[PDB]
Paper text:
We reported previously that the DNA repair enzyme aprataxin has a DNA 3′ de-capping activity, converting DNAppG to DNA3′p and GMP. Aprataxin catalyzes the conversion of A5′pp5′DNA to AMP and pDNA via a covalent enzyme-(histidinyl)–AMP intermediate. Aprataxin consists of two modules: a proximal HIT domain and a C-terminal zinc-finger. The HIT domain is organized around a central 6-strand antiparallel β-sheet that, along with flanking loops and helices, forms the NMP-binding pocket.
In order to gain insights to how aprataxin recognizes the DNA 3′ cap, we grew crystals of the catalytic domain of S. pombe aprataxin that had been preincubated with GMP, the product of the DNAppG de-capping reaction, and determined the structure at 1.5 Å resolution. The crystals contained two aprataxin protomers in the asymmetric unit. The refined model included guanosine in the active site of the A protomer and GMP in the active site of the B protomer, in identical positions and anti nucleoside conformations. The phosphate is flanked by the catalytic His138, His147, and His149 side chains. The planar purine ring of the guanine nucleobase is sandwiched by van der Waals contacts to Leu38 and Met64. The striking feature of the guanine-bound aprataxin is an extensive hydrogen bonding network to the O6, N1, N2 edge of the nucleobase. The Tyr41 hydroxyl engages in direct bifurcated hydrogen bonds to the guanine N1 and N2 atoms and in a water-bridged contact to the guanine O6. The guanine N2 atom is contacted by the Arg62 main-chain carbonyl and the Asn50 side chain (which in turn, makes bridging hydrogen bonds to Tyr41-OH and Arg62-O). Asp63 is a bidentate acceptor of hydrogen bonds from the 2′-OH and 3′-OH groups. Lys67 makes a direct hydrogen bond to the 2′-OH and a water-mediated contact to the 3′-OH.
Residue numbers in the entry:
A (entry chain A): 33 to 231
B (entry chain B): 33 to 186, 193 to 231
The structure:
Amino acid sequence: SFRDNLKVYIESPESYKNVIYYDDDVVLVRDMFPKSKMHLLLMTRDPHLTHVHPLEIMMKHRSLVEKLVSYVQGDLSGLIFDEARNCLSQQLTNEALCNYIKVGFHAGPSMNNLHLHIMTLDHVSPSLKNSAHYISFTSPFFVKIDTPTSNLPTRGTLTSLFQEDLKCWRCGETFGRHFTKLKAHLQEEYDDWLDKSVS
Amino acid sequence: SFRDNLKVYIESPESYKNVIYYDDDVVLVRDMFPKSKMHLLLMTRDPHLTHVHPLEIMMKHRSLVEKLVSYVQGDLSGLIFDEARNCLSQQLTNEALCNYIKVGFHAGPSMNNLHLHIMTLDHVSPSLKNSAHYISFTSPFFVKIDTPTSNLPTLFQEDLKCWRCGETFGRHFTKLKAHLQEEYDDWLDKSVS
Ligand SMILES: Nc1nc2c(ncn2[C@@H]2O[C@H](COP(=O)(O)O)[C@@H](O)[C@H]2O)c(=O)[nH]1
Ligand SMILES: Nc1nc2c(ncn2[C@@H]2O[C@H](CO)[C@@H](O)[C@H]2O)c(=O)[nH]1
Ligand SMILES: [Zn+2]
Ligand SMILES: [Zn+2]
């Protein structure tokens, strides 16, 4: 099934050119359908954890949460910032980018193998093709990795994401059901952020 | 009244040892009663903006909002990280600190001259002495500077909640205090180089 598509990256990371880091424990892979300018997935290779729902990981497997966060903040940090510079602009410092990257799980992932999203905020991407994808990263369905355990949402359903009034994550302007207009506005917001942020 | 006391920093910043930056437009000053390990205030010197309510600034003075943000992320960012290192640990990188600093206005300001808080998340401080102090920085009363304008208002009653893990302590302020210290030690241990 398509839900098992990510398994190949944790079975044979050495074989896939969009895997930009691996070791015995984790794989860092570029999303092939990126939903922001930079969109990476950090995957555990542990066969006993990969099929655990991310909300069960956040509640009951804090050892893994801490290990994943230690990779994002530690050994992989320079790699992630360099990928953002490649995806956005080389003139962005780590300091500019830190505030423009989010890290989290979906409350209802479409793929079966556990994957932590590491992505820029912009949501400017040709692969962002419908508003359910947008909502899945800009609502509580996106469970940030530092969410207090008391605050975790319910297990979700990607296909039930729907908003009658689509909303810009940065300024709050709304667009009804007109996703095309929202995308054009996200491009303007990105242009503005970039102008204000480059060195 | 004493509520006008921050005015001295924007009138005569050269005169006060807790001012760590000034220019014609802004002053960056240490909070005298810090509510986290690092707690700074960034103040406009503009006499026509200093007395404007912070929610009116957020709604109607986006020019000033963008200017404050540009100072905080731009020209003052190294001073801010250096201050954080002086207050927390010299072993902390800018990258570790950037996720541990919040920037915002109180929705109901306690002083009359406009002041943007720039502070670490810990709330470990001898000057944090009651529940109102804590809740005013960890609840929607603290209006982050990146809040969308669609989300702005025109509470302190509820149970104390750790901002980091969400554990609650009822109205037991002293238990919250000890817990914040444990949370800070834990963050620090994982964050130092
Ligand atoms: N540097 C300085 N800070 C002050 C003085 N008086 C009060 N403060 C700080 O000013 C802040 C005002 O925050 P507010 O609640 O008004 O948004 C408080 O955190 C308080 O500790 C003072 O004379 N000098
Ligand atoms: N790299 C990669 N990403 C995928 C594949 N199938 C789905 N995705 C992405 O994986 C994520 C799962 O939520 C989404 O962001 C998808 O765009 C695939 O075969 N390879
Ligand atoms: Zn917008
Ligand atoms: Zn806690």
